[PDB]
Design brief:
2 copies of one chain form a homodimer.
Chain A (H helix, E strand, L loop, with lengths): L4 E8 L16 E5 L4 E4 L7 E2 L10 E7 L6 E7 L6 E3 L2 E3 L4 E3 L3 E6 L2 E8 L6 E8 L6
Parallel strand pairs in A: 1-12, 3-4
Antiparallel strand pairs in A: 1-11, 2-12, 3-5, 5-6, 6-9, 7-8, 7-10, 10-11
Chain lengths: 140, 140
């Protein structure tokens, strides 16, 4: 068998334990085909990860997978799918329909949401795993 | 209203008029949301453009839309979705899960298939149009 790439995401929100923003979110490991486009946002019908929050567009941002030139493995690219809010990856600011490569480790945020992004590689080009972990406290 | 971006594709295959590779293809103008990922290949269930051909993978290649940095408009990026066959964009060769920006005019091919790609711009970031034209003869 091969090792599949897993994206570990560790997430914080201040209203995490009072509001119900995270009540739909799965904390299982999720194994997905590399053709999949992972969607984050408000719309429960198409978003793999739904946030029950009015401060969130129906689709906030998305992850797609692709093979870089001169690479034997899968890379994540992140794309801002929201008009209103600017997605911030590390120090960089993504506007509507802007996209970027995803650092092996990075800080993704929009709103009061904090996404610690951590990539462990795999040999597999067919599938990828994604994993949601609730942070007890802020990652600042 | 705004002008929407349209991708004109002019297509040729030698077995075009003898085989039934193109019998499912729409020649209408098709208006699609910029969140859409346009799929080309053999699988009729997910491919916006289906080719009835065994020399074609279930998904051959895909088009996605995004806003470049320092741009007010939509750009197409093309991605090879087939393991077997190498997609050729102009002079360049795309391997499995390789992607690239799509030239305003270019020649896309895999197999005996020829895709003349022609982009006319628009102001709209919400939608894009795509348009399939059968070529009477080869574009060499």
């Amino acid at each position: 068998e091969e090792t599949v790439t897993c994206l570990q995401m560790t997430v914080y929100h201040p209203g995490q334990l009072q509001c119900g923003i995270f009540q739909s979110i799965s904390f299982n490991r999720e194994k997905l085909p590399s053709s999949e486009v992972v969607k984050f946002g408000r719309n429960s019908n198409i978003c793999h990860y739904t946030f029950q929050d009015k401060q969130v567009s129906r689709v906030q941002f998305s992850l797609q997978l692709f093979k870089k030139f001169n690479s034997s493995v899968l890379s994540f690219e992140i794309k801002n799918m929201s008009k209103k809010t600017n997605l911030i990856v590390d120090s960089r600011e993504l506007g509507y329909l802007n996209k970027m490569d995803l650092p092996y480790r990075c800080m993704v945020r929009f709103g009061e949401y904090q996404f610690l992004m951590e990539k462990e590689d795999g040999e597999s080009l067919e599938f990828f795993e994604t994993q949601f972990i609730l942070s007890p406290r802020s990652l600042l």
